[PDB]
Write an enzyme that holds these catalytic residues in place. Structure first.
Site, mmCIF file in Angstrom:
data_model
loop_
_atom_site.group_PDB
_atom_site.id
_atom_site.type_symbol
_atom_site.label_atom_id
_atom_site.label_comp_id
_atom_site.label_asym_id
_atom_site.label_seq_id
_atom_site.Cartn_x
_atom_site.Cartn_y
_atom_site.Cartn_z
ATOM 1 N N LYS A 1 0.804 -1.183 0.000
ATOM 2 C CA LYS A 1 0.000 0.000 0.000
ATOM 3 C C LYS A 1 0.861 1.266 0.000
ATOM 4 O O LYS A 1 1.702 1.360 0.927
ATOM 5 C CB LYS A 1 -0.918 0.017 1.236
ATOM 6 C CG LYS A 1 -1.826 -1.186 1.287
ATOM 7 C CD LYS A 1 -2.785 -1.134 2.481
ATOM 8 C CE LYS A 1 -3.751 0.022 2.447
ATOM 9 N NZ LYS A 1 -4.434 0.146 1.124
ATOM 10 N N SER B 1 16.309 7.280 -3.903
ATOM 11 C CA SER B 1 17.337 7.032 -2.911
ATOM 12 C C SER B 1 18.447 6.128 -3.361
ATOM 13 O O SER B 1 19.649 6.325 -3.252
ATOM 14 C CB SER B 1 16.591 6.308 -1.766
ATOM 15 O OG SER B 1 16.247 7.326 -0.852
ATOM 16 N N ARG B 2 18.034 4.980 -3.892
ATOM 17 C CA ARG B 2 19.117 4.042 -4.256
ATOM 18 C C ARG B 2 19.732 4.447 -5.570
ATOM 19 O O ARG B 2 20.871 4.070 -5.840
ATOM 20 C CB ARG B 2 18.521 2.638 -4.255
ATOM 21 C CG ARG B 2 18.339 2.174 -2.807
ATOM 22 C CD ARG B 2 17.766 0.772 -2.781
ATOM 23 N NE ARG B 2 16.878 0.569 -1.643
ATOM 24 C CZ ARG B 2 15.889 -0.318 -1.618
ATOM 25 N NH1 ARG B 2 15.671 -1.089 -2.689
ATOM 26 N NH2 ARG B 2 15.166 -0.384 -0.503
ATOM 27 N N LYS C 1 9.906 4.310 -14.363
ATOM 28 C CA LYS C 1 8.648 4.527 -13.591
ATOM 29 C C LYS C 1 7.473 4.755 -14.546
ATOM 30 O O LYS C 1 6.749 5.778 -14.441
ATOM 31 C CB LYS C 1 8.758 5.687 -12.585
ATOM 32 C CG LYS C 1 9.746 5.384 -11.436
ATOM 33 C CD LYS C 1 9.257 4.294 -10.466
ATOM 34 C CE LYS C 1 9.643 4.425 -9.016
ATOM 35 N NZ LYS C 1 8.740 3.576 -8.149
ATOM 36 N N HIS D 1 2.517 -3.016 -6.336
ATOM 37 C CA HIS D 1 2.199 -1.834 -5.597
ATOM 38 C C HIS D 1 0.778 -1.390 -5.885
ATOM 39 O O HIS D 1 0.345 -1.504 -7.055
ATOM 40 C CB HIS D 1 3.063 -0.611 -5.961
ATOM 41 C CG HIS D 1 4.525 -0.797 -5.706
ATOM 42 N ND1 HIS D 1 5.424 0.036 -6.408
ATOM 43 C CD2 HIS D 1 5.219 -1.648 -4.954
ATOM 44 C CE1 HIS D 1 6.650 -0.307 -6.049
ATOM 45 N NE2 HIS D 1 6.572 -1.314 -5.160
ATOM 46 N N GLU E 1 4.518 11.704 3.278
ATOM 47 C CA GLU E 1 5.667 11.319 2.409
ATOM 48 C C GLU E 1 6.195 12.525 1.614
ATOM 49 O O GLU E 1 7.405 12.603 1.438
ATOM 50 C CB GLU E 1 5.318 10.188 1.449
ATOM 51 C CG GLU E 1 5.032 8.877 2.175
ATOM 52 C CD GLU E 1 6.345 8.193 2.482
ATOM 53 O OE1 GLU E 1 7.375 8.681 1.957
ATOM 54 O OE2 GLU E 1 6.366 7.129 3.224
ATOM 55 N N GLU F 1 8.375 14.476 3.980
ATOM 56 C CA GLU F 1 9.607 13.753 4.268
ATOM 57 C C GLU F 1 10.536 13.820 3.055
ATOM 58 O O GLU F 1 11.766 14.084 3.166
ATOM 59 C CB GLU F 1 9.296 12.294 4.619
ATOM 60 C CG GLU F 1 8.661 11.980 5.975
ATOM 61 C CD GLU F 1 8.346 10.482 6.131
ATOM 62 O OE1 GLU F 1 8.766 9.694 5.244
ATOM 63 O OE2 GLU F 1 7.689 9.993 7.080
HETATM 64 O O1 LIG Z 1 12.650 -2.454 -0.111
HETATM 65 P P1 LIG Z 1 11.848 -3.069 -1.145
HETATM 66 O O2 LIG Z 1 10.842 -4.195 -0.695
HETATM 67 O O3 LIG Z 1 12.696 -3.667 -2.368
HETATM 68 O O4 LIG Z 1 10.939 -1.930 -1.809
HETATM 69 C C1 LIG Z 1 11.756 -0.887 -2.435
HETATM 70 C C2 LIG Z 1 11.795 0.418 -1.608
HETATM 71 O O5 LIG Z 1 10.446 0.744 -1.314
HETATM 72 P P2 LIG Z 1 9.889 0.822 0.205
HETATM 73 O O6 LIG Z 1 11.168 0.934 1.100
HETATM 74 O O7 LIG Z 1 9.193 2.266 0.267
HETATM 75 O O8 LIG Z 1 8.976 -0.341 0.437
HETATM 76 C C3 LIG Z 1 12.441 1.551 -2.448
HETATM 77 O O9 LIG Z 1 12.399 2.726 -1.658
HETATM 78 P P3 LIG Z 1 13.595 3.096 -0.646
HETATM 79 O O10 LIG Z 1 13.554 2.350 0.606
HETATM 80 O O11 LIG Z 1 14.981 2.970 -1.401
HETATM 81 O O12 LIG Z 1 13.429 4.699 -0.530
HETATM 82 C C4 LIG Z 1 11.686 1.867 -3.757
HETATM 83 O O13 LIG Z 1 12.419 2.710 -4.629
HETATM 84 P P4 LIG Z 1 12.067 4.178 -5.082
HETATM 85 O O14 LIG Z 1 10.887 4.639 -4.097
HETATM 86 O O15 LIG Z 1 13.251 5.089 -5.004
HETATM 87 O O16 LIG Z 1 11.586 4.105 -6.612
HETATM 88 C C5 LIG Z 1 11.581 0.530 -4.545
HETATM 89 O O17 LIG Z 1 10.591 0.801 -5.500
HETATM 90 P P5 LIG Z 1 10.634 0.729 -7.061
HETATM 91 O O18 LIG Z 1 11.062 -0.717 -7.543
HETATM 92 O O19 LIG Z 1 9.234 1.020 -7.586
HETATM 93 O O20 LIG Z 1 11.594 1.912 -7.571
HETATM 94 C C6 LIG Z 1 10.899 -0.507 -3.656
HETATM 95 O O21 LIG Z 1 11.007 -1.724 -4.399
HETATM 96 P P6 LIG Z 1 9.800 -2.612 -4.890
HETATM 97 O O22 LIG Z 1 9.521 -2.198 -6.303
HETATM 98 O O23 LIG Z 1 10.213 -4.081 -4.577
HETATM 99 O O24 LIG Z 1 8.648 -2.228 -3.838
#
Ligand SMILES: O=P(O)(O)O[C@H]1[C@H](OP(=O)(O)O)[C@@H](OP(=O)(O)O)[C@H](OP(=O)(O)O)[C@@H](OP(=O)(O)O)[C@H]1OP(=O)(O)O
Ligand SMILES: [Cl-]
Length: 135
Positions: A12, A33-34, A126, A84, A59, A62
């Site tokens: 969520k 971030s990463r 994205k 998501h 958010e 933050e």
């Molecule tokens: O830790 P994960 O289970 O792999 O999920 C990560 C994490 O999302 P959350 O910590 O908010 O759950 C990343 O965020 P950060 O902790 O590095 O800030 C986010 O990356 P971004 O928000 O920078 O895009 C990334 O999401 P995404 O793959 O859409 O970029 C998302 O990974 P998932 O896609 O597995 O949820």
């Protein structure tokens, strides 16, 4: 923060399209971030029992260091590939803070984009966030 999930296992999340004014011509993106060379729409996970509009505003404070007037829910967007489910709101920015949590903590950046340029820089990594702007 504790991650939360819908009954189908999707994470969520909440996000806001932070516009510079009521004309909705420029929107605020933040760095990943990463991967700090990439831009994303500010947003993140909902905490347990947290209303999605509260999560979205929290958010944006933050990650982007702005506050403003919360506007309409644009819609609920699934990312099937990453599992998501994100509530996306409009926010009209009225306060830009200089030294916000993610700037101080992790060096996150923020930048204003005309809408068609935000769409362009979100498309490669994205694409669901680029679709936030389609309407
Ligand atoms: O830790 P994960 O289970 O792999 O999920 C990560 C994490 O999302 P959350 O910590 O908010 O759950 C990343 O965020 P950060 O902790 O590095 O800030 C986010 O990356 P971004 O928000 O920078 O895009 C990334 O999401 P995404 O793959 O859409 O970029 C998302 O990974 P998932 O896609 O597995 O949820
Ligand atoms: Cl604007």
């Amino acid at each position: 923060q504790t991650r939360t999930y819908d009954g189908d296992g999707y994470k969520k999340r909440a996000a806001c399209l932070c516009f510079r004014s009521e004309s909705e011509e420029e929107v605020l993106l933040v760095s990943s971030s990463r991967h700090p060379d990439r831009w994303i729409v500010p947003g993140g996970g909902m905490e347990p029992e947290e209303e999605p509009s509260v999560a979205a505003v929290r958010e944006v404070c933050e990650e982007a260091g702005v506050k403003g007037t919360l506007g309409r829910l644009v819609g609920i967007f699934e990312n099937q590939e990453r599992k998501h489910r994100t509530y996306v709101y409009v926010l009209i920015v009225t306060e830009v803070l200089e030294d916000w949590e993610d700037s101080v903590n992790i060096g996150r950046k923020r930048e204003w984009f005309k809408i068609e340029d935000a769409i362009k820089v979100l498309q490669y990594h994205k694409p669901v966030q680029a679709s936030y702007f389609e309407t």
